[PDB]
Design a protein around this ligand. Structure first.
Ligand SMILES: Nc1nc2c(ncn2[C@H]2C[C@H](O)[C@@H](COP(=O)(O)OP(=O)(O)OP(=O)(O)O)O2)c(=O)[nH]1
Ligand SMILES: Nc1nc2c(ncn2[C@H]2C[C@H](O)[C@@H](COP(=O)(O)OP(=O)(O)OP(=O)(O)O)O2)c(=O)[nH]1
Ligand SMILES: Nc1nc2c(ncn2[C@H]2C[C@H](O)[C@@H](COP(=O)(O)OP(=O)(O)OP(=O)(O)O)O2)c(=O)[nH]1
Ligand SMILES: Nc1nc2c(ncn2[C@H]2C[C@H](O)[C@@H](COP(=O)(O)OP(=O)(O)OP(=O)(O)O)O2)c(=O)[nH]1
Ligand SMILES: [Mg+2]
Ligand SMILES: [Mg+2]
Lengths: 84, 474, 474, 84, 84, 84
C-alpha cells in the first residue's frame, strides 16, 4: 500500500534533470472532497519567478499517480528542449 | 469462450508427468505441491521476520490468516456458480479441488522474497547500487559517472545490453525475487499453475519509459528480472497468456491481502500497552458508519476484535465474489485493469488504514527500527565491496581454486556466502558462450545478483548480528 | 448400524443454532470454527515454545505438518469408501467437507496445553505438589503428612471428597489442560464435534486403583480434571458415547502425530552442525530395509529428506487408511483398544526413533536445558507459596477489596496473575453453596488450579525472565 | 512416546510402601528378540536374601507395562498383609 | 502517610495470641460518609460460631486507629483470661 | 611456513607497474609430480591478445619463488622499456 522506491527515484531524477536546465518545479498534494482520490499539482517556473506551466493529476493509487507525474515532467522537459 | 482446463496446468519443468489423468491423480499431483511448500526452509524462516513490532504477529501468522480469507473467498465464488449451473460450461466440473489449493498456496508464499527490515531494507539495496552504475546517464546518446569500465557507454548492439543491465540492477523488488527464489535457488519444481499465482505485476525490471495506457495498473511495479526472460516466456506459452497479462486466480490472492492489512496491527497495539479499547472506540467513531463495527462492542479485548473480524468478513467477502463473477471475461483474458476492491465497502478499509497511519505507524519505537535497518543494510553492502572490484580472471581463479595466496582478504569474504548461491552462480555462468564480446557484462550482472541474493536471504536478527561481528564491536 | 450423522454434531454450548440446516449452512458453521481457532492467542503463543532445540522448528511449524498428514489420511479414507459405494450407507454423503476440517483443526490444537519446558516442566509441577498433599496416605482407613488442615482425614462423606481432591491435584497433564483452556479460560464456544477430537484419553485424573482390562490402552494417562466432570457428561450425551469411550476421528489425529515424530529432529540436527548426511546414511544403514530410504539418496541435504518424507508417506498412509476401514465397527463404538500403527511398517518408525534417541536426544546441550527448566519451574512455584498459606476469609477479602493494608506482600503477588484466570476463579467460586461444610475444600481446590493455570500458561522465555527478575538477579 | 511422571511416581510409591514392611524388590528390564515388546522382570525377596516371588511382564507400551507392574506389586503387598 | 510496620506486627501478634485460646476475630474496614474518618469494626467469636463481642473504632489516622484496635484486643484477651 | 606480505606486495606492484604500460600478465600455479616443488607459470601478453613471452619457475619455498617471479617481471619490464 506504500510507494515503491523506484518511482520516487524516477521522480527525483526527472526534477533534477529539468532543474539543471535553469528551471524550477513546485509541488503540492492534497485529498479530494468526494472523488476519493489523491491530488497532485505541479508547477514549472523559471528563475525570474515567471510561471511557465501548471498541471494537476488525480488518482487513488500512489504508484500510478507518481508515474503520471514523472512522464508529464519528461514530456515538459523534452518539449522545452525542442526549442530554447 | 471461458474454459478453465486450458488454465489449470498440472505439468512441471523437470520430469513432468505425461499422458491422460483422472481426478484422483490430479488431486494427488496438487497435494504434493503443498507437501513441498509447507516443509521448505523458506517458509520456516518466516517466523523470525518482523511484520510491524519487533504474542505479536510474525510474517508466518499473517500469511496463515490471508490463507483462510482467500480460501473462504474461493469457496464462496465456487458456491455462487453452482446456483447458476455454470460449473459445466466453464470447465470447473472436475477441477474444484485444485482451485482452492492454488489460491491457498499462493496466499501462503506471497512474502518469501522480501528483504530483512522490509521497506527500508529495499531502499538501501537500491540506493547503494544507484551510486555505482547511474542508470539515468544511459537513457540517451553516449555522453559518464559509471564506476565499472565494462559498462560505460562507448557500438549500439553492446550499448543496448549495457543500458539494460544498468537499469535492471537498481530495481530490486520482493515479488520479482520470489520467482527467482522458487525457481533457481531453492529448486522446488512446482507446477505451472502454482507459479503463475505468485506473478502479481508484469513490468520487466529493465523497462524504461512510459507504460501503455491499457495496463497502467499492472505495470506500476517491477515484476521479474532480466535473468528470467526465458523462464517467463515458457510460462506464458504454457498458461496461454499474452504479453503483459496476469493469471486469473492472482486477483483473489491480491484481495485477501488487502482485507487483512490493518486489522491485526490494531490488536497488536492494544496488547502492547499503547492505547485502550475505549480510546480505540473513540478514534474509530471520530474517524468517519453502518452496522459493522458498532455491533461488535456489545474478557473484552479478546472478544471485540473476535467479532469485528467476523462482521467485516461477512460484508466484504460476497462483494469480492460478485466482482469476480461479474467481470469474468476480462479477468480470464488477463487484461482487467483494476482491483476487486468507489463503493461503501471501500470506505471501511480506508477507515482502518487512516487510524493505523495516525496512531500506530508513528510511534517512536517503530520509526527507530527503520533507521537502524537502513544503516545495517547499507553497512553490510559496503563490507563486501572488495568482491565487486576484482577482475574477471581473478574472480574465476578464486571460484575455481578456492585457496588463493594472492588475495588473503577476498578469499575469506567469498567463503561466507551460502553454498546454494555459489552453485546458482556457477550454473548461470556455465551456459554462456566464452568466445563472445558480451561475456564480461553477463559475468558482472550475475555477480551483482549473487550479492543481492545473499543480502536479501537473511533474517533481521542474523543480519544485525553479522553487522556487529564484522565491525569488531561484539 | 454405522451412521455418522449421529456423531458429527454442529450444535454449541451457548447460543447454539437450532432447526434444520442444509449443506451450505453446515459448511459455514464449521468454517467459523477455523476462523476462531486460527486467530486465537493460544495458537499464536506456540511460536515461542521449543520443540527440541532452543531455522529450527517451533511447535507451530510441527503442528502445520501434522495437519497436512492428517488431511491426506482423511482424504485417502474418503476416497477408498467411494470405490466401494459406502458413502450413502454410512451417512457421509453430505458431510465430506466437515470430515477433513474436524481432523485438521484437531491436529492443529493438539499441543496447546503443554507447560513451558515440556516434559521436565510437567514433572516439576507434579513433584512440588506431592510434597504438600501426599495422596498416597489417603488410600485406606484414616491414619498423616498433609500440610493443609482442611484436607487431612478425620466422616466418610467428606473423606471421599478429600481423597479425590488430594489425588487430582498431583496429576497434571497437557491433554487434560487443553480442554480446560478451550472451554473455561479462553471461552471459544466451539461445536461438540470439534471438542470431541481433542479428548485423547479417558481416565479421570482422580482415578485410584486398577483399570479394567478392556480399556488398558485408553486409560494409560489422565484425560480430564475434576472441574470438568459436568462438562464431559454433556459431551458424552451429545456425541452418543458410553462411559470410558473415545471419539472416532481422534484415531486419525493420533496416527498423524506418530508419523511426524522423529523425522524433523534429524533434519534439525543435520543443520545444526552435529553430523553429516554421510554419517546419517551410515547410522541408518547399520540401524536395521525395503526400498523406502535407499531411493531418496540418488544441494543435497535440501533434497534428501525432501524425498525420504514422500517415500515414507506413500507407504505409511494407505496402511493407516486400511486399518481404519477394516476395524470400523469397533472404532465407531469407541471401544477399540489399539492404535492404527507388529508389521513391517511399524519397524521403519522404530528405526528413526532409535537413531534419534541414540544420537540426538543425548547431546549435552539438550540435557542442560532440561535441568535448567526443572530448576526454574520449581523456583517459580516457591515464590507464590505465600498465596497458598492464607485463610479463606483473608483470600476473600484480598480478591474483593483489591487494596489491603494487612498483607503488603501477598496483595502484590496476587496482582501479577492474568485477568482471565482471576475471572475464572471468581466464576467458579460464585456457583457453590455457601451454607455447606464442603466450601473450604472446593475453594482450596480452585485456588490450586488457578496457580497451576498461571504457571502452565507461560512461554519458556517469559518464565525464565520472570524467574531471574523476581530473585533480584537482573 | 515417553513415560508419564504419574506412573513412575506410583511405581516408586508401591516399592517404598512394600519395602517399609521389611521386604525388598529387585528390577530388571530388556528388549525381546522377536516379540517386539519391552520386558520387565521383578523379584520380591526378604532381608535374609530368600527369594519369595518372581514375575515377568511383556508389553510394547511403557505406560501399560508400568501400570501392570504397579498393580502386581500392590496385589503382592496386600496378599502378604493378608497373613504374616 | 502510610501505616508503620510495627503497628501491623502488634495487631497480628494480638490476634494470634487471643486466637491460640480457641477464639476467632473477624475484621472489616470502610470509609465514613461525612465524619471524614476511616472506620474499623472488629468482632470476637468462638469456635461454635457464637458471637461474643463487637466493637467499632473511628479515626482519620491509620496508626492511632490500629493502636486502639490492638489495645482493645488486649483488653478483651485479659478480661477473658480473668475467668474461663 | 606462509608467505610474507612484503613479497606479495612487491609482486602486485610489479604487475601494476608493467600493466600501466599497456601490457597484461596471466598467472597459473600447480604442484609438481615428483620434483616435490611448487610450480608457477607467467605469461606476458599485449592488449591485442598476442603472446609476447612466457616463463616457468620451480621451487619448494614460497618466498624464494615469489622473489624470482618479481625480479623476472622487473627484467621483462625494463627490457621492454629499453626500446618500444
Ligand atoms: N512500519 C510501517 N508499516 C507500514 C506502513 N504502512 C503500511 N505498513 C505495513 C502494513 C502492511 O501490512 C505491511 C505491508 O504492506 P506494504 O504497504 O508494505 O505493501 P504490500 O507489500 O502489501 O504491497 P504490495 O502488494 O507488495 O505492493 O506494511 C508504514 O508507514 N510503516
Ligand atoms: N528432549 C527430548 N525430547 C524427546 C525425547 N523423547 C522424545 N522427544 C520428543 C520427540 C517428540 O516429537 C516430542 C513429543 O513427544 P513425547 O514423547 O513427549 O510425547 P507425546 O506428547 O507425543 O505423547 P502423547 O501422545 O502426549 O502421550 O518429544 C527425549 O528423551 N528428550
Ligand atoms: N511506592 C509508594 N510510595 C508511596 C505510597 N504511599 C505514599 N508513597 C510515597 C509518597 C510520599 O511522598 C512518600 C513518603 O511518604 P510516606 O507515606 O512513606 O510517609 P512519610 O515518611 O512522609 O511519613 P512520616 O512523617 O515519616 O510518618 O511515599 C505507596 O503506596 N507506594
Ligand atoms: N590461522 C592460520 N594459522 C596458520 C596458517 N598456516 C600456518 N599457521 C600456523 C601454524 C604455525 O604454527 C603458525 C606460525 O607459522 P607461520 O606459518 O605463521 O610462520 P613462522 O613464523 O613459523 O615462520 P618464520 O620462520 O617466521 O618465517 O601459524 C594459516 O593459514 N592460518
Ligand atoms: Mg501480506
Ligand atoms: Mg505433536
Amino acid at each position: 500500500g506504500r510507494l515503491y522506491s523506484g518511482n520516487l527515484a524516477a521522480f527525483k531524477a526527472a526534477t533534477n534533470k529539468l532543474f539543471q536546465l535553469d528551471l524550477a518545479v513546485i509541488y503540492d498534494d492534497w485529498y479530494d472532497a468526494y472523488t476519493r482520490k489523491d491530488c497532485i499539482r505541479l508547477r514549472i517556473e523559471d528563475r525570474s519567478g515567471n510561471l511557465i506551466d501548471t498541471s494537476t493529476f488525480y488518482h487513488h493509487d500512489e504508484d500510478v499517480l507518481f508515474n503520471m507525474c514523472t512522464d508529464w515532467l519528461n514530456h515538459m522537459y523534452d518539449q522545452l528542449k525542442d526549442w530554447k | 469462450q471461458i474454459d478453465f482446463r486450458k488454465k489449470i496446468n498440472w505439468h512441471r519443468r523437470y520430469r513432468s508427468p505425461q499422458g491422460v489423468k483422472t481426478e484422483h491423480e490430479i488431486l494427488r499431483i496438487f497435494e504434493s505441491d503443498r507437501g513441498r511448500i509447507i516443509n521448505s526452509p523458506a517458509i520456516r524462516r518466516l517466523q523470525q521476520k518482523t511484520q510491524v513490532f519487533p504474542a505479536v504477529r510474525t510474517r508466518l501468522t499473517h500469511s496463515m490468516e490471508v490463507q483462510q480469507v482467500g480460501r473462504y473467498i474461493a469457496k464462496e465464488i465456487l458456491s455462487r456458480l453452482k446456483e447458476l449451473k455454470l460449473l459445466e460450461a466453464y470447465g470447473l466440473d472436475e477441477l474444484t479441488g485444485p482451485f482452492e489449493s492454488i489460491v491457498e498456496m499462493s496466499c501462503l508464499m506471497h512474502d518469501i522474497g522480501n528483504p530483512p527490515f522490509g521497506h527500508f531494507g529495499e531502499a538501501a539495496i537500491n540506493d547503494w547500487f544507484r551510486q555505482r552504475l547511474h542508470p539515468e546517464d544511459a537513457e540517451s546518446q553516449p555522453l559518464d559517472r559509471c564506476s565499472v569500465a565494462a559498462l560505460r557507454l562507448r557500438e549500439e548492439p553492446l550499448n543496448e545490453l549495457r543500458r539494460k543491465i544498468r537499469q535492471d540492477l537498481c530495481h530490486f523488488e520482493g515479488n520479482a525475487q520470489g520467482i527467482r527464489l522458487v525457481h533457481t535457488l531453492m529448486r522446488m519444481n512446482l507446477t505451472w499453475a502454482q507459479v503463475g499465482g505468485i506473478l502479481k505485476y508484469t513490468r520487466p525490471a529493465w523497462w524504461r519509459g512510459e507504460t501503455p495506457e491499457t495496463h497502467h495498473y499492472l505495470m506500476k511495479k517491477p515484476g521479474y528480472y532480466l535473468s528470467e526472460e526465458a523462464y517467463i516466456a515458457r510460462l506464458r506459452k504454457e498458461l496461454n497468456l499474452a504479453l503483459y497479462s496476469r493469471f486469473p486466480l492472482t486477483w483473489i490472492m491480491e484481495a485477501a491481502d488487502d482485507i487483512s492489512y490493518c486489522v491485526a496491527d490494531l490488536e497488536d497495539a492494544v496488547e502492547k500497552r499503547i492505547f485502550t479499547v475505549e480510546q480505540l472506540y473513540h478514534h474509530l467513531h471520530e474517524a468517519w458508519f453502518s452496522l459493522v463495527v458498532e455491533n461488535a462492542w456489545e474478557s473484552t479485548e479478546d472478544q471485540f476484535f473476535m467479532y469485528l473480524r467476523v462482521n467485516t468478513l461477512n460484508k466484504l467477502v460476497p462483494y469480492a465474489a460478485q466482482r469476480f463473477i461479474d467481470n469474468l471475461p476480462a479477468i480470464f483474458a488477463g487484461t482487467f485493469n483494476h482491483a476487486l476492491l468507489a463503493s461503501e465497502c471501500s470506505d471501511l478499509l480506508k477507515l482502518y488504514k487512516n487510524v493505523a497511519v495516525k496512531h500506530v505507524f508513528s510511534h517512536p519505537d517503530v520509526e527507530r527500527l527503520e533507521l537502524q535497518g537502513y544503516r545495517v543494510i547499507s553497512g553490510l553492502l559496503e563490507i563486501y565491496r572488495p568482491l565487486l572490484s576484482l577482475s574477471l580472471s581473478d574472480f574465476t581463479e578464486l571460484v575455481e581454486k578456492e585457496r588463493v595466496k594472492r588475495f588473503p582478504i577476498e578469499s575469506r569474504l567469498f567463503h561466507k556466502l551460502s553454498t546454494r548461491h555459489r552453485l546458482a552462480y556457477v550454473e548461470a555462468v556455465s551456459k554462456l558462450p566464452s568466445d563472445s564480446p558480451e561475456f564480461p557484462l553477463w559475468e558482472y550482472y550475475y555477480r551483482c545478483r549473487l550479492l543481492q541474493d545473499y543480502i536479501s536471504g537473511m533474517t533481521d536478527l542474523y543480519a544485525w548480528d553479522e553487522y556487529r561481528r564484522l565491525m569488531a564491536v561484539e
